[PDB]
Design a protein around this ligand. Structure first.
Ligand SMILES: CN(C)C(=O)c1ccc(S(=O)(=O)c2ccc(NC(=O)[C@@](C)(O)C(F)(F)F)c(Cl)c2)cc1
Ligand SMILES: CN(C)C(=O)c1ccc(S(=O)(=O)c2ccc(NC(=O)[C@@](C)(O)C(F)(F)F)c(Cl)c2)cc1
Ligand SMILES: [K+]
Ligand SMILES: [K+]
Lengths: 368, 368
């Protein structure tokens, strides 16, 4: 029975892999058998761990139709995977069947992020600061968990169903930045009828004058840069509306010994320090998606948690994404990525006593 | 008896004042009586609260001669203040005597910061990561507490023994920055035989083209900027040694609606994100003071916790001080100050169950 199975697998801790390990596994004659042996335990472990926390959500959120749907997807995928814990690594039909199942799960779970977001809209619409700390804690973990699950599903599906699965061993950082800029720029032009130029500079400090490349998932880097350009572009177009002269977005890329850093600087007027963290708060940025039935351009901020999720992508491989704003002037956004694949280790949430306490808990400084 | 008195006063919580309250109190016919009535409770409360945490330090730190000396200073000041809880607000001799006592305490406590730092050197020299979290927690609180105590002692001593005590209602921000730069620059020249130029720009967004002024303690702002210039100058001189061309330090000052921000940008090579927080770690930056008996220039980093203490000054009035470095390129340092005096409220540590737990305590994420 499901709670039995969820309880068994949720006792285990997820096991993080490094970018180097993902890479070395798939690089030369990736082994389907070996992948089966790992994932038939690991995917059920990851699924069960985060399912335990879906159960701790406020009842009015958990009971939303969109959250009920996501939970049912997880329940089904867990069950399908557990059909295989008894099968043999030597059973070629079992391996084939497992691979089919992984590919199928990959499709079922495609819409998980916006369906969850729709849940939060359903909950916000019909219904609290007591539990809004719980929702923030949950969504960071649920979306990081989903990122990690989708990584495994993609690796295995692409390897078995120059890139190694989703990984580019020589990801061209400036090319991805430019791709992000051009797509954000199209959306900026659609909405504001104008857009800032890009000024891009690079410094390869580790090997001066050489192209900057890292082992990375290019679509992860694309997501962060595109989301940040949208953010920088919106602030720029909104601050400079009256004068009608739009300062460019400036992007500085450096590869150091340990850090790849992408700094994005806008003159969009900034945000006071008191408010800057709202850009990463799910409840604060929970806005109804605009209707399909219109030709009016979609705004550069709104549905889908672009900015918190960008930061989760950065932090997933031990990187980070930080914002620094000077109110009345503009804002710097910085992506930090580990230069070395061996330093790029999955950051995975784990369900245990400490996680549970965090939902059922809540001072040494004077309250201002 | 001392533990009796410490226990009584440590039950109370310190009471934070705003910059506006400090200002309005002293602006027009500051009342000595009223100041006596507040401080005869408040100074014993603040003293007793932090004394409780000195007692929780690791035994090998607490027992250092320099920590023993600081504790004895606190014990004596507490005792002297408590001679007055029985006296009358109407007893003019008692008011005179209290004011004398405040002035005397102000002198006794002059050397508290470096004497405490000497304690940490004594402890480091003769003797652990288990308790190094406790020392970090303690020193932030002890130094913030000391900042708050010294504020009260200074206000009362200057008022009764255009500035209101230590407060300038019209602090000229650029003038203080320039003063910081020129003093840091002298030290840079002494040690490196060269120094970077300053490029300074300002934006008064709240009232464009007007001088930027805030109600502030100018010596607090001076300390932060001077310490940050030293930091920026060191990185610059050390990174650019070989080429012998030193990029200037650039400082951008903005006054927004809610934030005064001072951004200081250097091309000093930066620090990876993994290491940047060591600049604020007391144990990591605990270095023996150089000997008196030399004419060799003093380095721009070392004894006395310039950088963590700068950040405490920022945070004392609900501001902040943040560092952002791009490894292989350089570093931005940002001071955030509240533009409004009513928003500038003392940030005071309080001793209670939560504080105590923090010394006697010590996970929902996978360990990397
Ligand atoms: C020659 N060779 C295969 C290796 O060097 C090697 C062998 C094992 C590892 S590893 O760290 O144990 C490891 C690393 C990755 C995986 N699996 C995968 O990458 C996938 C395809 O199953 C995953 F879905 F992405 F997880 C597995 Cl099953 C094991 C890493 C590298
Ligand atoms: C006219 N007038 C005095 C006021 O507007 C006023 C009256 C009281 C306050 S207050 O917030 O209660 C207050 C504000 C500050 C103080 N005291 C002081 O400023 C000093 C000199 O004692 C201190 F040492 F700095 F704390 C006190 Cl005793 C009271 C603030 C302003
Ligand atoms: K677990
Ligand atoms: K207390």
């Amino acid at each position: 029975g499901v709670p039995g199975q969820v309880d068994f697998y949720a006792r285990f801790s997820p096991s993080p892999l490094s970018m180097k390990q993902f890479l070395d596994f798939g690089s030369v004659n990736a082994c389907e058998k070996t992948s089966f042996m790992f994932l038939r335990q690991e995917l059920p472990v990851r699924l069960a761990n985060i399912m335990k926390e879906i159960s701790l959500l406020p009842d009015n959120l958990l009971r939303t139709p969109s959250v009920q749907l996501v939970q049912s997807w997880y329940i089904q995928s867990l069950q399908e995977l557990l059909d295989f814990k008894d099968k043999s690594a030597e059973d070629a039909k079992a391996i084939y069947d497992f691979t089919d199942t992984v590919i199928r799960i990959r499709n079922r779970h495609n819409d998980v992020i916006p369906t969850m977001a729709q849940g939060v809209i359903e909950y916000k619409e019909s219904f609290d600061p007591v539990t809004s700390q719980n929702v923030q804690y949950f969504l960071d973990r649920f979306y990081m968990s989903r990122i990690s699950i989708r990584m495994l599903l993609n690796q295995h599906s692409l390897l078995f169903g120059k890139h190694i699965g989703s990984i580019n061993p020589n990801c061209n950082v400036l090319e991805v930045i430019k791709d992000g800029y051009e797509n954000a720029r199209r959306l900026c032009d659609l909405y504001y009828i104008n857009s800032p130029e890009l000024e891009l500079e690079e410094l390869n400090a580790k090997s001066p004058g050489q192209p900057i490349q890292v082992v990375y998932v290019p679509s992860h880097l694309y997501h962060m840069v595109f989301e940040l350009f949208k953010n920088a572009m919106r602030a720029t177009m909104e601050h400079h509306a009256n004068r009608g002269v739009y300062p460019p977005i400036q992007v500085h890329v450096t590869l150091g010994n340990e850090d790849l850093t992408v700094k994005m600087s806008d003159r969009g007027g900034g945000v006071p320090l008191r408010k800057i963290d709202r850009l990463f708060n799910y409840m604060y940025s929970t806005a109804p998606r605009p209707r399909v039935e219109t030709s009016r351009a979609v705004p550069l901020a709104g549905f889908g948690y672009g900015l918190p999720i960008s930061r989760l992508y950065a932090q997933y491989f031990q990187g980070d994404l930080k914002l620094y704003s000077l109110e009345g002037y503009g804002t710097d956004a910085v992506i930090y990525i580990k230069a070395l694949s061996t330093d790029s280790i999955e950051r995975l949430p784990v369900y245990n006593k400490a996680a549970w306490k965090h939902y059922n808990t809540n001072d040494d400084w004077c309250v201002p």
